[PDB]
Amino acid sequence: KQVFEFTEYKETKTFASLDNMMEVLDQHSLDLMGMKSQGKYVEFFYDRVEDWREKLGRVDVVVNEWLKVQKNWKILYNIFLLSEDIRMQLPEDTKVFEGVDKEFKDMMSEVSANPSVVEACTIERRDVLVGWSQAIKKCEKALNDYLEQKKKSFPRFYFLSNQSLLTILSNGQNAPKVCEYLGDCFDGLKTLTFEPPANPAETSKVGIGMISKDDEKVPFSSKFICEGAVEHWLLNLEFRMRETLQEILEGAKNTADLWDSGDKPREEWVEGYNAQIALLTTTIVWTEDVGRAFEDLAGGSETAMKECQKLIEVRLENLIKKVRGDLHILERWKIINIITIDVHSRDVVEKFVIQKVSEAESFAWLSQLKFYWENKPDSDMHLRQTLRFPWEKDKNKNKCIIRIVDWFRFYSYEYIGNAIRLVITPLTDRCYITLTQALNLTMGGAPAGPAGTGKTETTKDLGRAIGIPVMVFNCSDQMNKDSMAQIFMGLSQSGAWGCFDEFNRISIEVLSVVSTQVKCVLDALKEKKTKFSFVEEGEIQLQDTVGFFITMNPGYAGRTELPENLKALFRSCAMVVPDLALICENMLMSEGFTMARVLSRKFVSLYMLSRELLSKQKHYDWGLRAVKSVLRQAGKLKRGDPDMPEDPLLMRALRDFNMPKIVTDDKVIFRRLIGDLFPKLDPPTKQNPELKKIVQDTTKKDMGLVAEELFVTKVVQLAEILEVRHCCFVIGPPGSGKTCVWKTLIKSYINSGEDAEYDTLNPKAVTSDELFGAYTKTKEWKNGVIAVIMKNQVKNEEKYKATHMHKWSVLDGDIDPEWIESLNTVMDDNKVLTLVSNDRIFLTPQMRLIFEISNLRNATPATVSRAGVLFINETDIGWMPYMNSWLERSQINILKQQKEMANMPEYPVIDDVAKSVFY
Amino acid sequence: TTRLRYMIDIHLQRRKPILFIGSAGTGKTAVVRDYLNSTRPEQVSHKTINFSSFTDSLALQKNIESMVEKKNGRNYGSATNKVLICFIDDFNMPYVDKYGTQSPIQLLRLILDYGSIFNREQLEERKFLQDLLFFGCLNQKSGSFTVDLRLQRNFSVFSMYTPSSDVIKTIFGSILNAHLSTIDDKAQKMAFKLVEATYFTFDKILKNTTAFAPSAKRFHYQFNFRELARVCEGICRTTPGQYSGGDQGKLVRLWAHEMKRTFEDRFIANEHVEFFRRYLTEAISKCIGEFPETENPIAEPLIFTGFVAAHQGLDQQYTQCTIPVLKRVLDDKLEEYN
Amino acid sequence: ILESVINEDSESTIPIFFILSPGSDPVKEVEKIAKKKRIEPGKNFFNIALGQGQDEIARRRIEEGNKEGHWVMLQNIHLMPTWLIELEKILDSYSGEAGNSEFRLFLSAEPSTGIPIGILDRSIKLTNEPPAGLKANMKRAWTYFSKEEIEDKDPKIKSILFALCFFHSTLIERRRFGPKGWNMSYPFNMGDLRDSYLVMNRYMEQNQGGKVPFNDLIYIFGEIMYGGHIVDDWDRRLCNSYLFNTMHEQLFDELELFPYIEGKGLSFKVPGQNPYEKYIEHIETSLKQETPLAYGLHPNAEIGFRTDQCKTLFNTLLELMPKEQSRDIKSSNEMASDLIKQLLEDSELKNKIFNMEEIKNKIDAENKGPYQNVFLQEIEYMNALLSEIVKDLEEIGQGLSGLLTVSENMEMIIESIALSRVPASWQKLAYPSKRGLQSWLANLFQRIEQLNIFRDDPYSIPRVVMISRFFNPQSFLTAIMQVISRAKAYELNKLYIQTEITKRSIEEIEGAAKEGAYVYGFILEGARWDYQLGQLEESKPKEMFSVLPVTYCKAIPLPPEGKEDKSLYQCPVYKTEDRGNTYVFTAQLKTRFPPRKWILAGVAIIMDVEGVSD
Amino acid sequence: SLESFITFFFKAINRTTVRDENRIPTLILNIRQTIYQWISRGLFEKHKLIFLTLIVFRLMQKKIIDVAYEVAEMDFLIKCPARPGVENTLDWLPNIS
Ligand SMILES: Nc1ncnc2c1ncn2[C@@H]1O[C@H](COP(=O)(O)OP(=O)(O)OP(=O)(O)O)[C@@H](O)[C@H]1O
Ligand SMILES: Nc1ncnc2c1ncn2[C@@H]1O[C@H](COP(=O)(O)OP(=O)(O)O)[C@@H](O)[C@H]1O
Ligand SMILES: [Mg+2]
Ligand SMILES: [Mg+2]
Structure with missing residues (x-):
């Protein structure tokens, strides 16, 4: 009497929820088949x-068969669906x-009329289904061949899933x-801006600008129209990205020379232009500037190096003031990325003056x-690499070159x-030298x-400075010869730097291929040939600008030794x-400290000394992540x-924020340190008088506890x-008043x-x-105790965010690495x-989490x-405030007044003579 | 017990819970179990909970749920303003995880402070718990050595002390004197001697910590009250009519046998056995003073059973049976079993 | 050997296993021998190289090989670990079948873990190691470079290439020395030398008639070419010395590649301009005998190698020594553990443990010092060590003489005592310094002795401290600087610790000198510090290590700019002889010789050398 | 393998050309040589020394060849424990020695 309801897929009835039946059928097959043969009575x-x-x-084979066909049929059918372009291309298979x-x-409709699917399937039906599945596979193979042709046409498609x-x-x-999925191909250029079309039903083709991943808009010079073939208009877009960046830079460098002497500040000029172009044009007029300082020092002017130092250090300070005054978050990094290069x-010009070069x-x-x-x-650039873009070949317009x-x-x-x-x-700086020399030697x-x-992040940021695209690949030991070859084939086609994350963890078998594949590419780069012949799919476009970077970790567990050839x-x-020091220095310059450099070398030295002299506590965080969260407050x-x-x-800042975390033993040394x-x-202690007053008043009025200066x-x-x-x-000792x-x-x-x-909750x-x-x-999914409080607190409960300024969920259990x-x-x-x-579910800015733990031993460093710690010393709270609350009975009196605990024993009346004896 | 009994009455009037600590032998559970019976069933409603080290936090809640009646609203308490007492035994013995913190114990802390327990069915419902009291009974050197200090703070600690000559003699001396007086007007003085004797043997074993102690292979070796109690129980089994007359020779034999059979079985090694027999002879010879050297008071041949009596047509009679008589009874009964 | 071993044994069913080291090819030697035995054009026999996808071709070749009778050579066998488990099963099937006579299977692979035991067993093993020597290594470096490329290149470029070959050669010879040498094992291949030539080659083709920049080239060789291997950065300075000594303006003129050679009498120079064939002949004659002195090491540094070599041969031989003599009446491991336990129980270890509360109560905590903070932190670490070892001892002592379950870690401690190696759990606690078990206990009691003199009059610091006997030496140095920063009026960060060697012995009662801190138990390796001269000098030949006198440690502000002094030499101090990430701080000392000499010699300071009196 | 060792062991017996004059002595000598050379090829340069030290110490342990030693002294040779106690040394002799 079992069955399979058909769920319409618009317009095919489908077997959905078969697995629930499927599992029951498998259980029946298991015990039922074994019992009949094994049992003497059953025999x-x-x-x-x-x-x-x-x-x-019989039922199981037929049941696996639609699943193997429906999912794959769904996918191939969806490739044919709404694709007249792709239909006309392969008529024999589409039909x-x-x-x-x-x-x-x-x-499927006939089956929804029949009862058991396996009984309906019989054997002839199963054979027909297998033949249909084989026919569908053939279509997938044909479609796969078409994808390879498209993959050859556009390099970004190989990277895309x-x-x-x-x-x-x-x-x-x-x-x-389409523009949605270009964010996966490219480093920026998340989507494109568009002119609203003539008929509202049609989607826009006219591209006026490109949109970054952070929403920075670069306007195109003229309208960019999406032509027919998807690969053909995307390759015209890939070139139109470059063209527009190139076209602005010529304007940027002309205005760059003008701002120097010009009345308009540097910091105001940086705002007008884009984060990438601004940073480049900073580095360009830095190199011109340094180059004018060397030519002067050949003349004999000692001050040429000292003035170049002085100038670079004034712009750094002037920009540091701009990050301090309220700005727009996009404009922050457009300006802070400049702070990190200036x-x-x-530091370079300091180093040149000291060494006396x-x-x-x-x-x-x-x-x-x-x-x-x-x-x-006298352009040597036609020999050193291959000329690709028009401006590189023009030789009438200034081009941007990168020497090292x-x-x-x-x-x-x-x-x-x-x-x-x-x-x-x-x-x-040293790392950039190694990588550039590797490329110099192909x-x-x-x-x-x-x-x-x-390390992966440094190699990416190098290619970013150059402005070549950088692609990041991560290998989970599921990589095959075929899957890897496609990446290398794709990478070679389009100039693009390939950085491999966790490359060390690769099967020594598939690695010995990679070495042969890479060798064949490297052998082609040495010959410098425009076209080369790979092991399979020989005819591929080669570009000299491509480079392969692999990131090994010596300490990583399950490491495989690379072959001597590789x-x-x-x-x-x-x-x-x-x-x-160097990371802390940047973070300090990010917040706008003029003396940041001198403070950074001092700041780092404190933390390094602090770890050694203070007793080893798990709640103490001396990591970079803690330093940033202290600086952000400062x-x-x-x-x-x-x-x-x-x-x-x-x-004042360092003392204030570290004091709470630090225990009483360590408070004395740390203060002296x-x-x-x-x-x-001389540090002056800062306390908010309004917050301190209201806390003291509320604790006497309704908490019935003594407002002790330490508490x-x-x-x-x-x-x-x-x-x-x-x-x-809110960490602390086992018996205190943390709660x-x-x-x-x-x-x-x-x-x-x-x-x-x-x-x-606990x-x-x-x-x-x-x-x-x-x-x-x-x-069916049941709502968790944490998970429901998160739904309840947002809306439709007592904790709802309507009238409450600050809500927070309290947790008072012993933190664990599995649980956290x-x-x-x-x-x-x-x-x-x-x-x-x-x-x-998204945590609101007005929502907070408070954890209360005795020992942070089970917790990971x-x-x-990740979070801001607060240690409460047992001696600082004391037991006196309880005793004073007990003798006054104010604590006890309040609990009886305002609780649901009606059945509470009545505490005796304490005489003024009795109180003074007990106290 | 009387002074702890007073401390409980004090701690029951208040909502302050009590926690008892001590060895397996100390007799804490019984001292609480006596009180719960003496309390009035209308004023106070008692329930025992025992953890076998597989008792999850969910299973504890099911026991609490059943104990607590459903008050008006989300709050759950007993009707007619009855105070609800839940007795906990083997508090630390629930299985500890890698992290050294017990899931079932941590639940009780949420109940004591916040007074709200989240039911695994309908987790949205607060399910507030009220007028609940928890009475701990914790054995040291057992499962987890110590429980969480944040729970232990909410509990008022109390200790049962290890057995003492003055404590043992007042407990057992009063049981035996009440039973031996019903047997015979004579052999009352022999009761006190047997209590000092059983202690003396017990005490000489505790003194030799190297010989006998708690270990990996000595998990049972631990010497409690129960072994003294069942020794005292098996004397009380002896009917008057058969033990009537001179108990200078017959009682010490019985005692010695019964004593021996709760201590020998405890021991694994034949070395430990030899050490015990020497302590048992020294103990007997001290309290008795003068005893015949002709016949050893304790001997391997000497067995006592109340099944031999049933074969001979005696009713509820427990006496010394000879090896050859035992052979004949067992061999006859085996034919009946077959 | 290879011609003999094929004919004499492993005729059939026994495949031949080759183990190749880097820069050695088994296929070149076997093919020559293969041709003499039988007609081998490359058709009859196939030299199949194992790649991914070519596993099926190798399977077909070996299957065909057995029925045909022609032998089959497989190369890079380690590259496919899955196929070896498959191959094993094929060999077992063919051993039972028994295809055609005069059939063999040659397999060649780099040594690695996760090779199947079954294959390694059945197969004959044959190892080929290249001749090990400076000269033999320099020769292998020139053989790698193609004759026809070096002839084409002019005398200038080939002369500097030579000096690089030597530089590559000398690094492999340093790797042979542990602490005194590198301090770390780093992989070096021919491909890393080739890489460096190809860059050098371009720099000479650009400059042409204009003089070549060494300053440009040397940075690349130190920071890039052999920077990639060194992470530690202490080895990098040593790496740059060799480089700086080899590459200079006068290189193109005949100049000694070995450092200084003042009264050594090697007289080995770079060959003058002549034909390529003449370069190798001169190399072979002039190198003749290979000594430590050639690399810049001292003669005693070679003796110390034969010591470290000798020691390893006996630590291995101990493991290998079978059945423990097969009884007979030598003391058992558990007896030897009981005896050491009795010696520790005889000593008042429970008394030696210091209660933190008693010591804290003696201190007022208003007049407390940075020194006092360091000791309090140090004695806490010692208490945690001393409590742990007494716990492990009283537990194992109970387990020996008492019926109780014996844990796996406790059996290892018993085994470690018999061997007389410091235990793994104990080693992890306190200092990382390797010693004998009896030496450790004697050293530990001298640590305890330094804390006992602290417990009485804590406020009064001892006139002479011993940095050689602390848990963290660095922690103490941060302390001495803190005391100076209070007395003076500038930032602690700015102050750097500066050691100055004193002629006075421990006898001097003068202590707590203003802007100062006394130290002792410093030991200098690879050189001797003469007291009378007041300077570092070349070591006595027979004396391996030279103990330093009383060291005065002053704190003074850093220079505003990076200043290089010829007299002052920066030597690192290390806690242990191993010197592997045990760097504490850079000590400075006055030297009449150039620093370059001492960085090349490898001269460092060690805290514990086992040359400490009493 | 056990099997491979057995084939080498037998091979050593068949290589012996002596005809029962002094076969039993010369066979033992030929086996040692035959097995050693097989293993030595298998071993690295540094280990080849270590393996030869074993063979001789194992022949000495079992007393197949007559040598003047003590069992305690062979245990002391393989591992020497540094014993403190005496501060008085000679100038030339190291403190470790
Ligand atoms: N100012 C005060 N004076 C006296 N008693 C106080 C004062 N403030 C709080 N207390 C009392 O001290 C105790 C503190 O309880 P709390 O749960 O905060 O302790 P805790 O040890 O932090 O708990 P947990 O271990 O569960 O985190 C309560 O009895 C509380 O009412
Ligand atoms: N007055 C008494 N009479 C008899 N037995 C007693 C008495 N007081 C305590 N006990 C003993 O106490 C034990 C039960 O309570 P307790 O010893 O606390 O248990 P546990 O050892 O399981 O913690 C039993 O051995 C019981 O005989
Ligand atoms: Mg609490
Ligand atoms: Mg009990």
Whole structure:
């Protein structure tokens, strides 16, 4: 009596939910087949179980068969669906396929009339279904061959997933849908802006501008029309991106010379132009400037190097003031990426003055990544690389060239769209040398370092400075010869830098192919041939600008030793963790400190000394992630009082935020340690008088607890931490008033603003799966205890965000790495919640999380960094405030007045004579 | 017990919970179990919960749910303003995870402070719990050594002390004196001697910590009250009519046997057995003072059983049976079993 | 050997296994031998190289090979670990069948883990190692470079290439020395030398008549060409010395490649302009004998290698030594553990443990010092060590003489005591310095002795401290600077610690000198510090290590700009002889010789050398 | 393998040309040589020394060849423990020695 309802797919009845039946059928087959043969009584009546078992076995084959056909039929049918362009291209198969689809739609309707699918399937039906599936496969093979031709035509398509590729080819008319998936191909250029069309039904073709991943608009010179073939108009777009970047730079460099002497400031000129073009044109007029300083010092003027130093250091300061005054978040990095290159520039000229290098074409100058804007009338650039774009071949208009240690290659103009430039450091300068020399010799460049170095990010940021596209590939040991070959074939076709993440973890079998494939490309680059012949699909366009970068990790577990042949091809570079001074220096210049450099070397030295002299505590975070969250707080306070000097301000900030985390044993040493750095400077303790007053008043009025000067300071310190950090850890010893401190804060917020709902739970107590919520045996999702509070607090409950200014959910369990892993998305700065159901919930800016833990031993060091910690010393709270609350009975009296606990024992009346004896 | 009994009455009037700590032998569970019976069933409603180390937090809630009646609203408490007591035994023995914190224990903390328990069915419902009291009974050197200090803070700690000469003699001495007086006017003085004797043997074993102690292979070796209690129980089994007369020779034999059979079985090694027999002879010879050296008070041949009596047509009679008599009874009964 | 071993044994069913080192090809030698035995044009026999997809071709070739009788050579066998498990099954089937006579299977592979045991067993193993020597290594470097490329190149470019070949050669010879040498093992291939030539080659073709820049080229060789291998950066400075000494303006004129050679009498120079064939002949004659002195190491640094070589041959031989003599009456591992346990129980270890509360109560905490903070942190670490080792000892001592379950880690501790290696759990605690078990215990009690003198009059610092006997030496140095920063009036960050070697011995009662901190137990390797001269000098030949006298440690502000002094030499200090990521701080000392000499010699400071008196 | 060793062991017996004059002595000598040379080829240069030290110590342990030693002294040879206690040394002799 079992069955299979047909679910219409517009317009084919389908077997949906078959698996629930399928699993029951499999269970019946399992025990039923075994019992009949094994059982002696069952053996007598086997002529029954065996016939039934064969019927059960028959059902499964037919059931797997539609699933193998429907899913694949769905995909191929969707390639044919709404693709007249793709229909006309392969008529023999499209017609065969349409034949099969109509048959399938009919057979499924006939089945929804029949009972058991397996009984209906029989054997002849199963054979017919297998033949139809084989015919559909043939269509997929034919379609795959067509995709390869399209893949040869456009380099970006190889990088794009086949499911996406298929979607783009299907919707070739619908331009805005295609532009959506160009974000996956390119580093920037997420989508394109469009003129509203003549008929509203049609989607726009006319492209007026391009839109970045961060929404930075680059306007095109004239209208860009989407032509017919999807590959053909996308390749015209790929070139129109470059053309427009090139066209603005000629205007940018003319206005660049004009602003120097011009009345209009530098910082105002930077705003007008784009983040990429601005940063380049900074580096260009930096190299001209340095080049004019060398030519002067050949004349004999000592001050030429000191003035170039002085000038670069004034623009750095003038730009540092611009980041401090309120700006637009896009304009932040458009300006801060410039801060990270002008700091390096200043460090270069400092280094030149100290070493006393007075000759141009010294190694020290050849070493630096120089950008030259010159129409070289004796152009060697036609020999060094291949001329690709029109402007490179024109030789009448200034082109942008990029020189570094005997490796000169044109600025390819890819659009990166204001992604953050890494902090330049003497290691990265050295690293750029290794990679450029590898390319100069037409072989691969491999940086090997420990985990957390972010070597892949340095190689990307190098290609970004050059403006060549950079593609990032990650290998999970599922990579095949065929899947890998496609990437290399695609990469060669289109000038593009290939960086392999976790390349070390590759099967030594498939690696020995990669070595042969790479060797054949490298062998072609040495010959410098315009076309080369690969092992399979020989005829592919070669471009000299392509380069292959592989990132090995020596310490990684399950490491496979690379073959000696492959090791010889890829130049190894040594990679070390980036120096904490140079990262902290940037972060300080980001917030707008004039003396940032001097403070950074002092700041780093504190933290490094602090780890050694203080007792090892798990709650202490001395990592870079903690440093940024201390600086961000200091930066708001800097923006508040810019006129105050930097050293006294930093002093106050570092003490204030570290004091709470630090225990009493370490408080004395740490205070004296701080004195070492700023002995002359005297720190004044800053406390908010309004917040302190209301907390003291609320605690006497309604909490019935003694407002002790140490207690109230902790509440004020917590209130500050909740404002800056969305997620906070109220760590402490087993017996204190950790709970009372957060409870006092809420009742103060109620008196301050409006009522503040809080949802208390114990995460450790309840099972980790049940708390977050999981799927049952039946295909239905139950709401988790954390997950429902997140739905309830947004709307349709007591905790609803309507009248409440600040709500926060309290948690008082012992933190675990398994339990926190599910919550690690909320822990992070990005306010995103991940569940098993994949229901997306966003944490509001007015929502906070408070964790209350005795020991942070089970927690990971990374987890401590993620959130803002607060330690409450047992001795600072004390037990006196309880005793005083008990003798006064104010605490006890309040609990009886305002609780649902009606059945509460009456506490005796304490005599004034009795109280004074007990006290 | 009387002074702890007073402390409980004090701690029951208040909503402050109590926690008892001590060895397996100390006798904590029984001291609580006595009180729960003596309390009035209208004023106070008692229930025992025992964790076998597979008791999940969900399973504990099912036991609490059933105990607590459904008050008006989301709040759950007993009708007619009755106070609800839940007795917990083997508090630390629930299975501990990698992280060293017990899921079932952590639940109880959420109940004590916040007074709201989330039911695994309808997790949206607060399900507030009220007028609940929790009475801990914790054995040290058992499962988890110590429980969470944040729970232990909410509980008022109390300790049962290990057995003492003065404590043992007042407990058992009063049981035996009440039973031996019904047997015979004589052999009352022999009761007190047997109590000091059983202690003496018990005490000489505790002194030799190297010989006998808790270990991996000595998980059971642990010497409780129960072994003294069932020894005292098996004397009370002895009917008056058969033990009437001179109990200088017959009682010490019985005692010695019964004592021996709860200590020998405890011991794995034949070395430990030899050490015990020497302590048992020294103990007997001290409390008795003068005893015949002709016949050893304790001997391997000496067995006591109340099944031999049933074969001979005696009713509820427990006495020393000879090896050759035992052979004949078992061999006859085996034919009946076949 | 290879011609003999094929004919004499492994006629059939026994495939031949080759283990090749880098720069060695088994196929070239076997093919020559293969041709003499039987007619081998390359048709009859196939030299199939294992690649992905070519596994089916190799399977067909080996299957065909057995019935035909022609032998089959497979290369790069390690490259496919899945196919070896498949191959094993094919060999087992063919051993039972028993295809055609005079059939063999040659297999050649780089040594690696996850090779099937079954194959390695059944197959004969044959290893080919290239002759190991400076001269033999220089020769292998020139053989790699194609004759017809070097002849074409002019005398200038081929002369500097030569000096690079030497530079590559000398690095492989340093790798042979552990601490004294590199401090770390780094892979170096011929491809990394070839790479460096191809860059050099271009720089000479551009400059033409204009003089070649060494300054441009040397940076590349130090920071790029052999920078890629070195991560530690202490080895990089050593790497640049060799480079800086080899590459200079006078290189093109005949100049000694070996450093200084003042009274050494090697007289080995770069060959003058002559034909290519004449370059190799001169190389072979002038190198003649290979010594440590050639690389810049001291003679005692070679003796120290034979020591480190000797020691390894006995640590291996101990493992290999079978059945533990097969009884008989030598003391068992558990007896030897009980005896060491008794010696530790005889000592008052429980008394030696320091209660933190008692020491904190003695301190007022208002007059507390940075020194006092370091000791308090140090004694805490010691307490945690001393408690752990007493726990592990009293537990294992109970397990020996008492009936209790024996844990796996406790059996390992018993095994480690018999061997007399420091335990793994103990080694992890406290200092990372490797020693003998009996030496460790004697050293530990000298640490404990330094904390006992602290416990009495904590406020009064001892006149002479011993940095050789701390958990973190660096922590102490940060402390001495802190005390100076209070007394003075500038940032702690600006202050760098600067060591100055003193002629006074421990006898001097002068302590706590203003802007100062006394130190002792510093030991200098690869050189001798003469007291009378007051400077670093070449070591006594027979003396391996030279103990330093009382060291005075002053804090003073850093220079505003990077200043290089010829007199001052920057030597790193290391906690252990191994010197592998145990760098603490850079000590400075006055040297009449150039620094370049000492960085090349590898001269460093070690805290514990086992040459400490009493 | 056991099997491969057995074929080499037998081969060594067939290579012996002595006809029962001093076969039993010369066979033993020929086996040692035959097995050693097979294994030595298999071993690296550094290990070839280590393996020869074993063979002789194992012949000494079992006393197949007559050598003047002590069992305690062979254990001391393989591993030497540094014993502290005496501060008095000679100038030339190292403190470790
Ligand atoms: N100012 C005060 N004076 C006296 N008693 C106080 C004061 N503030 C809070 N208390 C009391 O001290 C105790 C603190 O309870 P709380 O739950 O905060 O402790 P905790 O040890 O942090 O808990 P947990 O271990 O669950 O995190 C309560 O009895 C509280 O009412
Ligand atoms: N007055 C008493 N009479 C008899 N047995 C008692 C008495 N007081 C305590 N006990 C003993 O206490 C034990 C039960 O309580 P307790 O010892 O606390 O249990 P547990 O060892 O499981 O924690 C039993 O051995 C019981 O005989
Ligand atoms: Mg609490
Ligand atoms: Mg009990």
